[PDB]
Amino acid sequence: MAHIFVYGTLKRGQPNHKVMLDHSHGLAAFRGRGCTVESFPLVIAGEHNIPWLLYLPGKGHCVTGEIYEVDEQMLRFLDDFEDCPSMYQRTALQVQVLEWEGDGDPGDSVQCFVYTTATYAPEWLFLPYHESYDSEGPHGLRYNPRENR
């Protein structure tokens, strides 16, 4: 019964999207769309091309993305798929609403939940920042979960 913000992994065309396509892994509904008007460090790291959102308000860029309403099971599935608390931690941040679908209208920003890290190595602050995360992009650095898939 919560509102979250997706960077990319269940938006453009990422491997992870399939999770929210079976209600038995939890509820998702397109509850409008948004960006982090709060500038964060979206950096690409790890040998499997695992970008991270370090919890640093006002450092970096505004990640464009989408706002899903979720049930407690979707919020819990991501609480086990993402290897949190080890890898990530679930946190609260500020998200500009680019569209709001339905009642319960917070104004032009909302407080969503996101997975972040506070436990990072300093090398990841020397990394470049980005405004979305899309396998389609010309970078040539895309996620490798089953590759062959």
Q: Does 10 appear as a known binding residue?
A: yes
Query: Which approach determined this entry?
Result: NMR
87 contacts 117 by C-beta, under 8 angstroms: yes
CA 19 to chain centre: 14
37 contacts 5 by C-beta, under 8 angstroms: no
Q: In the chain, where does DSSP find H-type helix? A: 72-81
* Number of Cβ within a 10 Å radius of residue 77: 18
Q: Does 8 appear as a known binding residue?
A: yes
Question: Burial, 4: exposed, middle or buried (Cβ in 10 Å; 0-12, 13-18, 19+)?
Answer: buried
Q: Does 7 appear as a known binding residue?
A: yes
Q: In 25-131, where does DSSP find H-type helix? A: 72-81
Helix, strand or coil for residue 112? strand
Helix, strand or coil for residue 79? helix
Distance CA 106, CA 127 (A): 34
Q: Residue 69 half-sphere exposure, CB side, CA atoms within 13 Å?
A: 10
* Radius of gyration of the CA atoms of the chain, in A: 15
Q: Residue 87 half-sphere exposure, CB side, CA atoms within 13 Å?
A: 14
Tokens 């989408």, located at residue: 66
Q: Does 117 appear as a known binding residue?
A: no
Catalytic option among 82, 123, 131, 147: 82
**Superfamily, domain 1-149:** Gamma-glutamyl cyclotransferase-like (3.10.490.10)
46-60 per-residue burial string, b: 16 or more CB within 10 A, e: under 16: eeebebbbbbeeeeb
Annotation says 82 is catalytic: yes
Tokens of residue 148, six digits: 């062959």
